[PDB]
Every structure is written in structure tokens, then in C-alpha cells.
């Protein structure tokens, strides 16, 4: 299947409480493998997955230097955006950055990303062609004009199509036992009487990896969305994921309903029916 590597940076200003908080995490697919926290004691990039711990001191030194450089630039970015938006020094504000790359089942480059948000809304984002920018508003046009005149996108194209792909491949190989595994969901259905009139059917998918999954209800073989509820896919805490979907049905008609489970670890989609 396809894979991705992504880094997520969160920078939060703390007026009167010293330097801004800075947190960086790195993911391969749905597995976190590194973190950095400006408030932690070590002041180093740290491992968060077993397979990355085999990297030697030059790796950790290099990643620590780069993540501190990212932190220094975000410190200034907060002050820069406060000016663009004519905001006071009194309030707390949040800058987010995400970048990384997707590859196909042949592990060749598919898509690259490099984008920013300010206080929860888009600020600027590299477009899919890796040559141009989407400025979310008038303030972000300033950044876009600067980045265009400096050909910033061309240097990022090289990282997203080169280093990012190459090291995603290296991680996928070094972590093959866990990153290349496909844990199919374990499934079951529960039934609860809400009254003497209607019943809730709940279709469960447990201990699956990766997170991507589709649970759908059908009645008489036709897709059914009315009277259904679907929760967000959620982490089990052991590296796997969980999800459920429910439908409320008239009592005596449970046998008309089927839950359908699609996941990359299934050789064929599953169809569950009550009892």
C-alpha cells in the first residue's frame, strides 16, 4: 500500500511567561517515531518508536540541530504574524506547520506538502505542483510574494521529492516488522434494546492498523445513512486503532441490516449480520 512521512510543529506564544512553547512530532503513516518539546529537560530530538532507536549519534545530533533551527524560525514567525495582523503583544497565538510526502505502493513519490496555519485557520500552503502557493488571505500574500521572488518552492521540491522519500524508504525498511504490517480489524456486532420498539445495532472494528478503514451500514443490500452514528477512529494506545458504527432499527427487522468493513488488511471486505 501507500505510505507517508509527516512532521507536525506547534508553536504557542506565552506573553509574560517567557519563550514560546514549541512541540514537534514526526510520523510514518500512523506511527509516531520522534518528538521534541521546548519545555522538556533534554533539549534533544527523542525516539518514540523502537525501530528508530538504532539510529546512531550523528542522526540524533543532526535532527536535534534542525529541530532547534525550526524552533528559532517559529519564534520569529509568531512576532512576524502579530505584525501582519496588527495584534497586540498581550494575547497568546498559535502557529502550526506541517510538511512531508506521500508515496505509492512502489514507494515512489506521489505528493508533497508544506503548509502553515495561524490561530486555527489556513495561512499559506504549497500547492500540489510544488511550484506555487495558496495564500489564504491578504496578509499571507506578503509571505507568498517573498517566497516567490526567492524561489523557496524550488528548494522544498528537492526535499519533498528527494530526502523525504529516501528516508521514508529507510524507515520503512528498518521498521519493517511494525511499519509494513497490516493488522486486519477484529469485528463483532452488539445488540441493545432501547425500548420494546427499537434496537441499536453496533458494528465494532478493533486492533487494526493502519488507521484507514470504512464501516458502512446497509439495509436489504442498499447503503443506509439515516439513523446511523459513526465515531471518529481512535487509538487503542498499543499502536492499533478502533472504530464503531451504529444503526437504530425497528425491533423485529434486525435481519435486514448488514455492516460492511473495508480495510487494507482484509483479503475481502467483511459483511456482518446480527447473530
Amino acid at each position: 500500500g501507500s505510505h507517508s512521512m509527516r512532521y507536525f510543529f506547534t508553536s504557542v506564544s506565552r506573553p509574560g511567561r517567557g519563550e514560546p512553547r514549541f512541540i514537534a512530532v514526526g510520523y510514518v503513516d500512523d506511527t509516531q517515531f520522534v518528538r521534541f518539546d521546548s519545555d522538556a529537560a533534554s533539549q534533544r530530538m527523542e525516539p518514540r518508536a523502537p525501530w528508530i532507536e538504532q539510529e546512531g549519534p550523528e542522526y540524533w545530533d543532526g535532527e536535534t540541530r534542525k529541530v532547534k533551527a525550526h524552533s528559532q524560525t517559529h519564534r520569529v514567525d509568531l512576532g512576524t504574524l502579530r505584525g501582519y495582523y496588527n495584534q497586540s503583544e498581550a494575547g497568546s497565538h498559535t502557529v502550526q506547520r506541517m510538511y512531508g510526502c506521500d508515496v505509492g505502493s512502489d514507494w515512489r513519490f506521489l505528493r508533497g506538502y508544506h503548509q502553515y496555519a495561524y490561530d486555527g485557520k489556513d495561512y499559506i500552503a504549497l500547492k500540489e505542483d510544488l511550484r506555487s502557493w495558496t495564500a489564504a488571505d491578504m496578509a499571507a500574500q506578503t509571505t507568498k510574494h517573498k517566497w516567490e521572488a526567492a524561489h523557496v518552492a524550488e528548494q522544498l521540491r528537492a526535499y519533498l521529492e528527494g530526502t523525504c522519500v529516501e528516508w521514508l524508504r529507510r524507515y520503512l525498511e528498518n521498521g519493517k516488522e511494525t511499519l509494513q504490517r497490516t493488522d486486519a480489524p477484529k469485528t463483532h456486532m452488539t445488540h441493545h434494546a432501547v425500548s420494546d420498539h427499537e434496537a441499536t445495532l453496533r458494528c465494532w472494528a478493533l486492533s487494526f492498523y493502519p488507521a484507514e478503514i470504512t464501516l458502512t451500514w446497509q439495509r436489504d443490500g442498499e447503503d443506509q445513512t439515516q439513523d446511523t452514528e459513526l465515531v471518529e477512529t481512535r487509538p487503542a494506545g498499543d499502536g492499533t486503532f478502533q472504530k464503531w458504527a451504529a444503526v437504530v432499527v425497528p425491533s423485529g427487522q434486525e435481519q435486514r441490516y448488514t455492516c460492511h468493513v473495508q480495510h487494507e488488511g482484509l483479503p475481502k471486505p467483511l459483511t456482518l449480520r446480527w447473530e
Binding site: 543532526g62 535532527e63 534542525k66 529541530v67 508544506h114 522544498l156 530526502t163
Partner: peptide
């Protein structure tokens, strides 16, 4: 691996 590119808003 992180990028080393200098990017400032």
C-alpha cells in the same frame, strides 16, 4: 529526517 531549508514567513 527533518528538512534543513530556511523558511521564514
Amino acid at each position: 529526517k527533518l528538512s534543513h531549508q530556511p523558511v521564514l514567513l
